[PDB]
Amino acid sequence: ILYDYFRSTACYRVRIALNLKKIAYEKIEVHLLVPSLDINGQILSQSMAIIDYLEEIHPEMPLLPKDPFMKATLKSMALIVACDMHPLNNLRVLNRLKEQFNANEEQVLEWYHHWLKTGFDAFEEKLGALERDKPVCFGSEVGLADVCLIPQVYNAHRFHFDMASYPIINEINEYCLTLPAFHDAAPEAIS
């Protein structure tokens, strides 16, 4: 049982992860902990934690390489998104800017775009040191970094940030968006 909010980036990651490794689950659409997984009564939060659990009980369709260093390297790229980007732009943060600072619309956008630039700069950076056979983050299979990247890029277009500066990312996103696992997990697919 996945408890799901369709506008949630975190939830988008989980939805992709569940598809990629072809895990049979069961969705429960709610409003506004999401995502959260119910495992025979036992509830688990935090999208990165949720994904690592899946990865552990369902080792097939690995979202990470075996090489301990590469595994950690890809992980840290997923963290760039999940730690150095998403947290700053969460609805809760935008609202604090509005409460505390009565941020007008251009202000929220400038803030929001600021962390996009910083996060995509760093991401495309490390991206440039890896080799790939297709437009995925690394290698010849889609992984954890791609799982976290697609939802972040979705947010960026939604807030109309211009991706011109990030060719490799733009390619990977385009590629990934043609897989059912990604496509069917999109928020639009939900409604």
Add this chain to the structure above:
Amino acid sequence: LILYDYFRSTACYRVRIALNLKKIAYEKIEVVPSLDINGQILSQSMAIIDYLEEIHPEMPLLPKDPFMKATLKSMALIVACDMHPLNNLRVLNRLKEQFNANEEQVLEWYHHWLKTGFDAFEEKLGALERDKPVCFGSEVGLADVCLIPQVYNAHRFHFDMASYPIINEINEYCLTLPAFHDAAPEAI
């Protein structure tokens, strides 16, 4: 094996601790954090620790049960994801740059995220069993490694921890152990 380190960076504090718990020898350079493995560099504090845990399985920072392992992972994420990033220097600077925020406004911000996170953390703590002041069971783990340094940030910024009895017990206990004590910024 090299660690680019800053003594008062709570992310590096997390890493220093894990290196100690695992008794891994390493060269420390005070400029982060970044781990330099034979010329190859790795950069996210949570990624680094996961690397230490795969490369050095012994002195496990997490239990074997997949659920409890995931559960403590998520508590660690409460801190690493829902707390620390919002209160990073770069963010505070941004508030003063974009909103010309003042001291007292920066503090209100900083404390709001402290409160929000500790509330959640203390919450999940209440559902868990322990035989000493650690997050879970009778051995320190990854959650402890992330909690202590966050707590340090809370004191450093004069945030009242009165409402988090368990957290406060854990912080106290863990700081009695050399692995934590010797990784603290004061020690550095």
